[PDB]
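Notes to self after the Tuesday call (sharing in case useful).
The group wants a holo model before anyone commits to mutagenesis around the pocket. I volunteered. Ligand is chlorophyll A. Logging inputs and output together so the record is complete.
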Amino acid sequence: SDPEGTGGFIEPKWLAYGEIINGRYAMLGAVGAIAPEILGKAGWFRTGFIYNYWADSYTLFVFEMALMGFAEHRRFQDWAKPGSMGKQYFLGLEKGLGGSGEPAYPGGPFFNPLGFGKDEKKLKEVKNGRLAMLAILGYFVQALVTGVGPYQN
Amino acid sequence: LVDRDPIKTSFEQWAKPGHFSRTIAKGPDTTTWIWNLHADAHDFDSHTSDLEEISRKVFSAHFGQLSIIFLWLSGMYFHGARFSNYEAWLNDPTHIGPSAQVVWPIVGQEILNGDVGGGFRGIQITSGFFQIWRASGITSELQLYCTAIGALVFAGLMLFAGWFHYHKAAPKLAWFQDVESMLNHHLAGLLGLGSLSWARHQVHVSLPINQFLNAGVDPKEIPLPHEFILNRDLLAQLYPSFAEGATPFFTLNWSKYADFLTFRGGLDPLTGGLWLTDIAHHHLAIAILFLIAGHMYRIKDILEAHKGPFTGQGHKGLYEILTTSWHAQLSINLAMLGSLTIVVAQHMYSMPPYPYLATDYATQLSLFTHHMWIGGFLIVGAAAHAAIFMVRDYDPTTRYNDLLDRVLRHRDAIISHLNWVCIFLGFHSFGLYIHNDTMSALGRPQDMFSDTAIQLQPVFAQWIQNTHALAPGTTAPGATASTSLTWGGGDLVAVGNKVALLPIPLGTADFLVHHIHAFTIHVTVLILLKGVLFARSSRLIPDKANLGFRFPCDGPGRGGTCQVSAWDHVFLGLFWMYNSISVVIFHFSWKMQSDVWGTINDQGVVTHITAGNFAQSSITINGWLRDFLWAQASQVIQSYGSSLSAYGLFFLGAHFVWAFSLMFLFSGRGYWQELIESIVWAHNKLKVAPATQPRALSIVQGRAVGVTHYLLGGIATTWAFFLARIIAVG
Amino acid sequence: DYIGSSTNLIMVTTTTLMLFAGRFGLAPSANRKATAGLKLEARESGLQTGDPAGFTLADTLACGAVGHIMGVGIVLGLKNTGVL
Ligand code: CLA
Ligand code: CLA
Ligand code: CLA
Ligand code: CLA
Ligand SMILES: CC(=CC=C/C(C)=C/C=C/C=C(C)\C=C\C=C(C)\C=C\C1=C(C)CCCC1(C)C)/C=C/C1=C(C)CCCC1(C)C
Ligand SMILES: CCCCCCCCCCCCO[C@H]1O[C@H](CO)[C@@H](O[C@H]2O[C@H](CO)[C@@H](O)[C@H](O)[C@H]2O)[C@H](O)[C@H]1O
Ligand SMILES: CC1=C(C/C=C(\C)CCC[C@H](C)CCC[C@@H](C)CCCC(C)C)C(=O)c2ccccc2C1=O
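Result:
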């Protein structure tokens, strides 16, 4: 049958909740700060420059975001379910070996039960604060007064 | 109807004779329903007896205009781009004479393609792109080629919002049937946030990229594609980076400035398109209002308020049904939209807003008559659709005893006056001219009505013109010249190719055209006014809302009982307006060339396209074909074998099509029936006719094929007559 | 900063001039026309005390109270007060 797309008060928000969640680690620059020593800038004006850069260049940029976008909509179809994903191998009874299950988090299950001593002393907050990390570099791209500078100071 | 539903087909209705009123297109065959179907295709007395949808259609079938105006423009930006002449014309204005269109040399074609400027074969333009396009804080042919697809983007998308309505399961009532906010939004931030937004991209970028164009260069020896960011350093030539100010307010010091704006009025010597140093300020000073203004509000309240004695008790309650009409809230609009277009038509020619207009003569009068036919073609409409209200829209009569029920109360009255108004005019408004003939052909000028014989004496001056070009000495601050250079007092020096605007003097031969307008504007409106007013009931027919606002004519009795109705008052009301506008046009160019347009040289001894022939000689209404129609038009009837030629070569057709309208206008109906059978007979003998009962024209369709023709005839005639006497000398 | 810092506080001289003169002028509304200088409701001198307009429209002058002379024809005389 024809593919689906249900609008209803607020899908736009579940996938819009999600869009920013992905962009909250695609925030990148300060989430993984080792990521850019100077990589936030794609490649100053002076700026910095005492290109933008040495580089990691190239082409084959569309093919990626398309081809691995050709996966985003698969963990979105495959696990509609009827399971058989582990096609195993025709012969060979020796394949008990599992790996996990369906994973979200420390894996197959949680695992290695046994825990607490020290580490010691929902979950839209695990969202809310990282747009308060996203939109922040947003103005920090253009983060300048330039002619003048910090009035504050 | 099935097919069959409700609920329980997706299977669409392709096949099974008919739809549209219920002993419908009947099984039994006919032709009339094939002009039916197209006509009244949009309507609402059928589709459903229930509002609901209709607004859910019109907010969609709307959409496909914007998208269209959007597929259009693109082929104009593209066109105004790679079919170039714009690049070539801009380094080289005063000189060129623009093109965008070109043939392909099939058959006779090519004559139509005649050297236009930056070195190429093509057909000219009287549609002032190449001049909005002055803007391009950038320049480049392939660039317009982005603004172009940027156009096709808005479209497909601003055309899939139309899928994303009606066809998608739609909104409903409340959504529009709560009106509460609508203008709040619209005027605030778009009316505002455009004009506003337009400010930001009207000094940022444009001002500078013609501040140092009004001199020389060749583009890209100027205005890069990015250059205009943070680099507030070239913005340095055209005022400070605020230096020491912080967000206006006052603890500011000017020992020598006052931001961009520094208000102008007049005309650039080198590009008299009015100054741009202003053009930001005015749009800024707009938006604010809109920005503040679109913040009313939520609605009755304000109208449910001020009443009086004779005034409007129903003022209070002036329509619940103004959230429940359309045909009403469209008719109102058209009067404004329409009447607010031809107010353009003036502020344009007496105050150009684009670089290179006036000098460009033909590329802003075309305008002033195109914009001019809309501030007219949209007004008779603005009546039609009120007649469409007055007849039907609401369910019952829930609307009662108010402003209207009032106006109607008198009705053989509001239109009782207005009538005499017209015959007072007409006698004082046309036979006035006829005097001259009858007495200048009798010939005794002592007693004509000349700008000189009947007592007026070498001055017009003392009225209000002369207190307009002189007003920068009131509460007025100032700024050299006026507001519109065409005003009485001071100044001259306007332009170094040809001319632009200067005083434009008056008296008589300006006095009385100005009056024919009155009588013309007035008897137009009489027929529409009385037409929409007497929409539904009368003492020739009271049983007279019983079908619709059309209906051919009630019937041979009562004496006549023919025209009546109001489709037809909006049929004989077009018939006039075609004059209303058609003679207003006739006015402007005979003025604007008889005086104004003309030309400088040494001692700037002015030499109008015509040494004021107007003088003593429009006053004669033959002079209007001595000096007009037979004088100019000599360029239309000489135009063969040329480049424009398509005008002279239209000017015969369409000067034919009009003289084909009368056939549709002037004739019976069972006539072309009585005829259509003689035909139908000869048909049957060979065995070649019956199926789909061939029929004559639907009494009022016949009128529909008058009028519409009489206009596309009688009009393009001049559209040709014109473009042929401003291209080439003038 | 700059003089614009003594102007950073001048955001107050308009915005607080505006918004502090705000509430009162819309407070006992549902009123429209009318007041005391017309139709029945009554007592005089004319007066005296009733806010927004009076105090803050006087404060535009007030902002020019102490920065006066210091910005003007720069410093003159030998202590205009006579005291140490
Ligand atoms: C690909 C799609 C598509 C399809 C299959 C349909 C199918 C349908 N639409 Mg529809 N519609 C569409 C896209 C589509 N629509 C879009 C994109 C819009 C908004 C732009 C609409 C807005 C719309 C409305 C308001 C209505 C429908 C209705 C309908 C139903 C009647 C259709 C009909 O016979 O009209 C025939 C008309 C056309 C095929 C042409 C459409 C006109 C526009 C969009 C383009 C033509 C303008 C063009 C420039 C012509 C003038 C210039 C000329 C000189 C060449 C039918 C189920 C009607 C309904 O629900 O039943 C009463 C209802 O009236 N549609
Ligand atoms: C904002 C407004 C606009 C809108 C949205 C409408 C909408 C409507 N009008 Mg309307 N109208 C308008 C402005 C508007 N009008 C104006 C300005 C006038 C004054 C002229 C009118 C005069 C008018 C009348 C008299 C009628 C309507 C009717 C209607 C309704 C029928 C529409 C229809 O079926 O298409 C009709 C369109 C056609 C059938 C296409 C034929 C167009 C021909 C004449 C071509 C025009 C000449 C052109 C140069 C030819 C193309 C080039 C060619 C040489 C190749 C509809 C609700 C009708 C109604 O009954 O109300 C329910 C009624 O007939 N209108
Ligand atoms: C719109 C046009 C109109 C007007 C205003 C005039 C005016 C004139 N024509 Mg004339 N004319 C016209 C159309 C007009 N004509 C036409 C169409 C033709 C050809 C058919 C002519 C052929 C023609 C000829 C051959 C002559 C004239 C002449 C004249 C002049 C003499 C008039 C006269 O003696 O009447 C007598 C005047 C009165 C009895 C005045 C009373 C009428 C007025 C006051 C009515 C006002 C209403 C009232 C004020 C309302 C207020 C209410 C009250 C309670 C206050 C006069 C200037 C003659 C001439 O030589 O002119 C130089 C010459 O005879 N005309
Ligand atoms: C069918 C009839 C017969 C014929 C052949 C004509 C012909 C004409 N009449 Mg006429 N007339 C007639 C009966 C006739 N009349 C009757 C019985 C009356 C009432 C008594 C009149 C009353 C009358 C009047 C008042 C007028 C005319 C005028 C005209 C002429 C217009 C000029 C012209 O067409 O140049 C011929 C050259 C061309 C047509 C070149 C055409 C090239 C262009 C249009 C492009 C090619 C065609 C293309 C398909 C168009 C593009 C459309 C596209 C969108 C599809 C034309 C010669 C008018 C005139 O000019 O002077 C009197 C005037 O208005 N007639
Ligand atoms: C004869 C003819 C034609 C004619 C024609 C004529 C003789 C005329 C016509 C005309 C047309 C027209 C005319 C149309 C149009 C148009 C247009 C496009 C317009 C536009 C405009 C506008 C925009 C608005 C207003 C103004 C104007 C008009 C400009 C033909 C014939 C034939 C034959 C043989 C057979 C076959 C077919 C044919 C081939 C066809
Ligand atoms: C057309 C019918 C005449 C009725 C109106 C005449 C009254 C005003 C006199 C002429 C009006 C035209 O105005 C025109 O005057 C002069 C023509 O001699 C020209 O004079 C111009 O040429 C010379 C070059 O430096 C100098 O004399 C002037 O400084 C300069 O303004 C101008 O281009 C224009 O200002
Ligand atoms: C001349 C005239 C007619 C006769 C006009 C007619 C019959 C015009 C209709 C002719 C049609 C348009 C011909 C259609 C035939 C073709 C479309 C079919 C072939 C398809 C093409 C490929 C050719 C009337 O019916 C009429 C009615 C009311 C008032 C005045 C008049 C009037 O003046």
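Two things stood out.
Chain C has one domain: 1-84.
The domain at 1-84 of chain C is CATH 1.10.286.40 (GTP Cyclohydrolase I; Chain A, domain 1).
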